[PDB]
């Protein structure tokens, strides 16, 4: 035990359970409920004062959200220990990994699982996009879709964090180069950014590889994405119906992409 909220409600344990894009995640406890939570520290790095204003507001709206396919958000605050400042978020603890870990671990996803899990992602997104006002995820990826069990349901996570992962910022060329929706680079986005991201997720789940692996850096990716050049893995999608859905999601022009409604209504997404 290595920390607590200002109110003593949440404790942090000396048990690190994730480490990633500028965060460390620990096991924790809700002392009020006596139920285990994820204690995420957004790592000694500076948020802007403007981001903090947006974040105070966001955190309060996230605390209200419930849906089967969204990871629960409990509470948030700024915390320090020694010379390190972080923002803490406390969320529902997800103990069975991510779609990314699933693909790593079990090389392939069977089509009936793909269908069900993708329908659940769409239901989650429909839910967010239909909140008033709409919630746009803006950072959906296989590593932020959590599974409740190997045989369980999927829940979308890292709501909130997407605000602090900064599309229009200059960034280092380090690790695996990333893509996003064309319009996202300019921060000129709507819900359809999530549709694009969904398409990319489906592609990954269908191919068991990260799109654009044939690119060495994010500049090559940017040039391909904003010029309508598809990832090579697109051509490797085995099932034509799956490939068709992907293709309609990852259109360069946002106005031509499937809507979530149309995807949920697609033949594929009823059994
Ligand atoms: O956001 N992550 O990427 C994440 C990854 C892991 S991991 O150990 O699976 C790994 Cl080693 Cl980061 Br892939 C654990 C927790 C988290 N945060 C979640 C935030 C909201 C849902 C609840 C927890």
Q: What is the DSSP string of 73-120?
A: EEEEEEEEETTEEEEEEEEE---S-BHHHHHHHTS---HHHHHHHHHH
- Torsion angles phi and psi, residue 94, rounded to 5: -110, 115
Long-range CB contacts (< 8 A, 24+ apart) of 132-136? Answer: 134/191, 135/61, 135/65, 135/159, 136/189, 136/190, 136/191, 136/193, 136/194
The count of domains in the chain is: 2
Is residue 71 in contact with ligand 1, taking CB distance under 6 Å? yes
What are the beta bridge partners of residue 252?
none
Quote the CA–CA distance of 192 and 173 in Å, as a whole number: 27
Q: Could you tell me the distance, in angstroms and rounded to a whole number, from the CA of residue 17 to the centre of ligand 1?
A: 7
Could you tell me if 85 and 208 lie in one domain?
no
Could you tell me if 169 and 246 lie in one domain?
yes
Task: State this model's resolution in angstroms.
Answer: 2.9
Marked catalytic residue, from 158, 190, 255, 262: 158
SS3 label, residue 201 = helix
Q: Which positions make up the binding site for ATP?
A: 21, 91-94, 141
Domain, as residue range, for 178? 93-271
**Experimental approach:** X-ray
Which atom of ligand 1 is found nearest the CA of 101?
Answer: 13
- E-assigned strands of 84-212? 84-92, 145-147, 154-156
Which atom of ligand 1 is found nearest the CA of 17?
Answer: 8
Cα-Cα end-to-end distance for the chain: 47
Quote the CA–CA distance of 42 and 186 in Å, as a whole number: 24
- Look at residues 92, 114, 143 and tell me which one is the last residue of a structural domain: 92
Is 158 among the catalytic positions?
Answer: yes
Could you tell me if 21 and 65 lie in one domain?
yes
Could you tell me if 232 and 253 lie in one domain?
yes
Quote the CA–CA distance of 38 and 90 in Å, as a whole number: 6
Is residue 139 in contact with ligand 1, taking CB distance under 6 Å? no
What are the beta bridge partners of residue 171?
none
């Amino acid at each position: 035990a290595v920390g607590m909220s200002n109110d003593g409600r949440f404790l942090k344990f000396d048990i690190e359970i994730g480490r990633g894009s500028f965060k460390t995640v620990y096991k924790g406890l809700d002392t009020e409920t006596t139920v285990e939570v994820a204690w995420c520290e957004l790592q000694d790095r500076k948020l802007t004062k403007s981001e903090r204003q947006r974040f105070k507001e966001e955190a309060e709206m996230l605390k209200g959200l419930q849906h089967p396919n969204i990871v629960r958000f409990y509470d948030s605050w700024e915390s320090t220990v020694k010379g390190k400042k972080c923002i803490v978020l406390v969320t529902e603890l997800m103990t069975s990994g991510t779609l990314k870990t699933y693909l790593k671990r079990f090389k392939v996803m069977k089509i009936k699982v793909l269908r069900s899990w993708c329908r659940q992602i769409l239901k989650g997104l429909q839910f967010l996009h239909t909140r008033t006002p709409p919630i746009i995820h803006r950072d959906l990826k296989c590593d932020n879709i959590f599974i409740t069990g190997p045989t369980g349901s999927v829940k979308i996570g890292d709501l909130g964090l997407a605000t602090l992962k900064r599309a229009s910022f200059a960034k280092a060329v380090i690790g695996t180069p990333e893509f996003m929706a064309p319009e996202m680079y300019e921060e000129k986005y709507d819900e359809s950014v999530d549709v694009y991201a969904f398409g990319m997720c489906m592609l990954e789940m269908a191919t068991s590889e990260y799109p654009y692996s044939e690119c060495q850096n994010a500049a090559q990716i940017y040039r391909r994405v904003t010029s309508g050049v598809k990832p090579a893995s697109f051509d490797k999608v085995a099932i034509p119906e799956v490939k068709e859905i992907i293709e309609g999601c990852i259109r360069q022009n946002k106005d031509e992409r499937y809507s979530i409604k149309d995807l949920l209504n697609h033949a594929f997404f009823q059994e």
